[PDB]
Amino acid sequence: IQKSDDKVTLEERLDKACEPGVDYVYKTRLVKVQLSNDFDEYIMAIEQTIKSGSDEVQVGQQRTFISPIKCREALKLEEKKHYLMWGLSSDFWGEKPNLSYIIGKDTWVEHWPEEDECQDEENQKQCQDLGAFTESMVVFGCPN
């Protein structure tokens, strides 16, 4: 989703992440990046489950994000970083114990800076929006 992180507000995240099309909302980390000729895969671990969907995954379990190689320069996924990823349930690929996901055009990937990295003035607004995002969907959920 090519909306910029400065152009999106907290209320835009509240409107987009509470849609019934959007199935999963997670703040997570990634472990392994495997680069292949067909598609690049990301073994990725659950840090929090902000909004669980049709996949029953627990905190600390690992899943796989599949992206095409042309998005490898576009995603800019660096290892041991935190990312906010949401999206729809149409990106189911495998079966239930071996579920794989697809980074589609409707998949929201955002850089989540760390707790020390919130101390910068450039990352203050993003940390405030993402903290109020977590404190709105974890504690109170999504209305309608």
Description of the molecule:
The PDB classes it as immune system. Keywords: innate immune system, complement, activation, nanobody, immune system. The entry is titled "Structure of methylamine treated human complement C3". The protein is Complement C3. Organism: Homo sapiens. This is part of a larger assembly, with one chain. The chain is α+β, with helices and mostly antiparallel strands and 144 residues long. Helices cover 18% and strands 29% of the residues. The protein contains 3 helices and 6 strands, in the order H-E-E-E-H-E-E-E-H. A 6-stranded mixed beta sheet has the order 5-3-2-1-4-6, with helices on one face. A hairpin with a 4-residue loop joins strand 1 and strand 2. The chain is globular, with a radius of gyration of 15 Å.
What's the shape?
A: globular
* Terminal Cα span: 23 Å
Biggest sheet strand order reads: 5-3-2-1-4-6
How many β-strands, per DSSP?
Answer: 6
Q: Total helix count?
A: 3
Radius of gyration: 15 Å
- The SSE order reads HEEEHEEEH
Give the strand content. Answer: 25-35%
Helix content: 10-25%
Describe the biggest sheet? Answer: 6 strands, mixed
Please describe the topology of this protein.
Blueprint: H1 10-17, E1 22-34, E2 39-45, E3 62-68, H2 72-75, E4 82-88, E5 100-102, E6 108-112, H3 124-137
Parallel strand pairs: 3-5
Antiparallel strand pairs: 1-2, 1-4, 2-3, 4-6
Glycosylation sites: 98
Protein name: Complement C3c alpha' chain fragment 2
Disulfide bonds: 18-142, 118-127
